[PDB]
Curated annotation (Swiss-Prot), chain A:
Palmitoylated. Palmitoylation is required for targeting to postsynaptic density, plasma membrane and synapses. Palmitoylation by ZDHHC2 occurs when the synaptic activity decreases and induces DLG4 synaptic clustering. Palmitoylation by ZDHHC15 regulates trafficking to the postsynaptic density and function in synaptogenesis. Palmitoylation may play a role in glutamate receptor GRIA1 synapse clustering. Depalmitoylated by ABHD17A and ABHD17B and to a lesser extent by ABHD17C, ABHD12, ABHD13, LYPLA1 and LYPLA2. Interacts through its PDZ domains with ANO2 and NETO1. Interacts with KCNJ4. Interacts through its first two PDZ domains with GRIN2A, GRIN2B, GRIN2C and GRIN2D. Interacts with ERBB4. Interacts with KCNA1, KCNA2, KCNA3 and KCNA4. Interacts with LRRC4 and LRRC4B. Interacts with SYNGAP1. Interacts with ASIC3. Interacts with SEMA4C. Interacts with CXADR. Interacts with KCND2. Interacts (via first PDZ domain) with CRIPT. Interacts through its first PDZ domain with GRIK2 and KCNA4. Interacts through its second PDZ domain with the PDZ domain of NOS1 or the C-terminus of CAPON. Belongs to the MAGUK family. This is Disks large homolog 4. Expressed in brain (at protein level). Detected in juxtaparanodal zones in the central nervous system and at nerve terminal plexuses of basket cells in the cerebellum. Expressed in cerebrum. Expressed in hippocampal neurons (at protein level). Isoform 1 and isoform 2: highly expressed in cerebellum, cortex, hippocampus, and corpus striatum.
Swiss-Prot record, chain B:
Coiled coil: none annotated. The chain holds residues 95 to 101 of 101 of the full protein. Residues 1-7 are annotated as: Sufficient for interaction with DLG4. This is Cysteine-rich PDZ-binding protein. Component of the minor spliceosome. Within this complex, interacts with RNF113A, as well as with SF3B1/SF3b155, SF3B2/SF3b145 and PHF5A/SF3b14b. Interacts with DLG4 and TUBB1. Interacts strongly with the PDZ3 domain of members of the DLG4 family. Associates with microtubules.
Length: 117, 7
């Protein structure tokens, strides 16, 4: 059989367009201290972000609708995302090493997947 | 430090 898990998670930036009307995007963000970045920590099953199938825990949010968030604070990042409108254009980049700093007992394996012991 | 928000 041909298992996905062995395959490396792409590390280059991607464009994700989520259409969520007037409901939550369905994911959590962490970070936003001293320009450490804004990262996805949790995606809600069945939510708009999940239904896109193009975002994952450990993704850094680089921008929303053209607004650079690489250096944003967590609160202003949340404000930007919550007020982004019905159609939300995210530029994300998978940064599992930087993300693993946040979640207890986490680490990155050989394929780039975030593992928690 | 830290903060986590649902969006």
């Amino acid at each position: 059989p041909e298992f996905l898990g062995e395959e490396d998670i792409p590390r280059e930036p991607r464009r994700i367009v989520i259409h969520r009307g007037s409901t939550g995007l369905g994911f959590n963000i962490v970070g936003g201290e001293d320009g450490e970045g804004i990262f996805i920590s949790f995606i809600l099953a069945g939510g708009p972000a999940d239904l896109s199938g193009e975002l994952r825990k450990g993704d850094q949010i680089l921008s929303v609708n053209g607004v650079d968030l690489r250096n944003a604070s967590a609160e202003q990042a949340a404000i930007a995302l919550k007020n982004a409108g019905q159609t939300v254009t995210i530029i994300a980049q998978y940064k599992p090493e930087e993300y693993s700093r946040f979640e207890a007992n986490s680490r990155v394996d050989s394929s780039g997947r975030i593992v928690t012991d | 430090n830290y903060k986590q928000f649902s969006v």
